[PDB]
């Protein structure tokens, strides 16, 4: 059953590399982790505030590095996205991270930037709910939260997806992407999306008018070797007001996919709505039939 958590072996490090956390949401998160018998390590600066950021870059880097020093940690679950984790990229000690025993980094939204950087450096990661999702359709939300422990245990290996137009084909490549806006906002920097040839580019977003999505897509595709992608795979675009625009969002995305001669898929249950099922970031997967399979 998909609301059922798997035990998480070892300990989960909780860090806040992006936006600041409300006290009551943090405490509610920890209580839910305890309900589930999850042993955790709380980063020492998770309650820090520096404007809307969870502390200074230096504070956040200390917590992320500490998460990689402790030997019993088997996953690093980001508490909140929002904005700010790209700020850490010029400070990360990548060597100290490759040397630690495997501990997938987990999150979505702004955390997509760190997922991509981790993939570039050969580090495991998971695109899925942030941990404060625990402290906030309710059934879908609960299945999405449960999907993290289930993927860490290796017991889920597929999601449903639909091919939009085109023709029947099989696409195999690395799973990359996440939040369109966050990733576009790293183009031209050291944190630009890692997009090896043949990759399946997953995209989702929230809270944007269509012209801002198109602008972001144009930028992202112009900044990578787009013609060498295997596929573009849309998750959800939630709270994105159409505002009288003549073309649907899928028409716009379809025009871009056609221009680069890459197939387009959609309805992956991933993003800012109730459906946000975890998927392994940077692994080889196959688009076949009606699913994405790893």
* Residues near a copy of itself, by CB under 8 A: 19, 49, 51-52, 82-83, 86-87, 184-192, 210-211, 214-216, 218-219, 222-223, 245-247, 252
Distance CA 168, CA 145 (A): 32
Nearer to a copy of itself, 72 or 222 (CB): 222
Q: How far is the CB of 150 from a copy of itself (least distance, A)?
A: 32
Cβ proximity to a copy of itself: between 227 and 293 the closer is 227
Cα 138 from chain centroid (whole Å): 20
Integer Cα distance of 224 and 276 in angstroms: 26
Alpha carbon of 283 to those of 99, 173, 220, 279: distances in Å?
20, 8, 21, 9
- Closest to a copy of itself by CB, 8 vs 186, is 186
Closest by Cα among 56, 186, 185 to 120: 186
Residue 216 Cβ vs a copy of itself, minimum distance, rounded to whole Å: 7
CB of 174 to a copy of itself, least distance (A): 20
Query: Residue 142 or residue 252: which is nearer to a copy of itself going by CB?
Result: 252
Answer whether 147's CB lies under 8 Å from 127's CB. no
3-state SS class at 190: coil
Rounded to an integer, what distance in angstroms lies between the CA atom of residue 146 and that of residue 3?
A: 6
Of the pair 69, 218, the CB lying nearest a copy of itself is at 218
Tell me how far, at minimum, the Cβ of 110 lies from a copy of itself, in Å.
9
- Considering the complex, what minimum distance in angstroms separates the CB of residue 242 from a copy of itself? 11
Nearer to a copy of itself, 40 or 210 (CB): 210
Cα angle: 1, vertex 111, 214; to 5 degrees:
100
How many of the other CB atoms lie within 10 Å of CB of 140? Answer: 16
The nearest distance, CB 224 to a copy of itself, in angstroms, is 8
CB 244 within 8 A of CB 215: no
To a copy of itself, the closest distance from the beta carbon of 55 in angstroms equals: 13
Which one, 162 or 218, has the nearer CB to a copy of itself? 218
Rounded CA separation 57/79 (Å): 16
């Amino acid at each position: 059953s998909d609301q059922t958590w798997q035990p998480i072996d070892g300990r989960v490090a909780l860090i806040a590399p992006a936006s600041a956390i409300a006290t009551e949401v943090l405490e509610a998160t920890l209580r839910q982790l305890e309900v589930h018998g999850v042993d955790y390590h709380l980063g020492r600066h998770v309650e820090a505030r520096y404007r809307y950021l969870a502390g200074t870059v230096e504070q956040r880097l200390e917590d992320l590095h500490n998460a990689f020093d402790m030997p019993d940690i088997t996953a690093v679950w980001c508490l909140r996205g929002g904005y700010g984790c790209g700020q850490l990229l010029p400070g990360l000690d990548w060597g100290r991270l490759e040397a630690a025993s495997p501990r997938p980094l987990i999150g979505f939204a702004d955390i997509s930037v760190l997922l991509s950087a981790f993939h570039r450096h050969g580090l495991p990661a998971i695109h899925g709910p942030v941990a404060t999702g625990l402290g906030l359709e309710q059934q879908e939300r609960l299945a999405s939260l449960a999907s993290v422990s289930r993927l860490l245990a290796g017991i889920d290996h597929e999601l449903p997806v639909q091919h939009l137009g085109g023709h029947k084909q099989r696409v195999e490549g690395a799973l990359i992407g996440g939040n369109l806006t966050a990733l576009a906002c790293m183009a031209g920097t050291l944190g630009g999306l890692h997009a090896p040839a043949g990759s399946i580019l997953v995209l989702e977003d929230v809270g944007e008018p269509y012209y801002r999505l198109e602008r972001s897509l144009w930028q992202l595709l112009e900044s990578i070797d787009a013609r060498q992608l295997g596929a573009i795979c849309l998750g959800s675009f939630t709270d994105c007001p159409r505002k009288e625009v003549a073309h649907s969002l899928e028409r716009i995305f379809g025009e871009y996919a056609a221009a680069i001669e890459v197939p387009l898929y959609h309805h992956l249950p991933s993003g800012h709505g109730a459906q946000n099922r975890a998927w392994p970031y940077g692994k080889t997967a196959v688009l076949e039939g009606n699913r994405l399979r790893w």
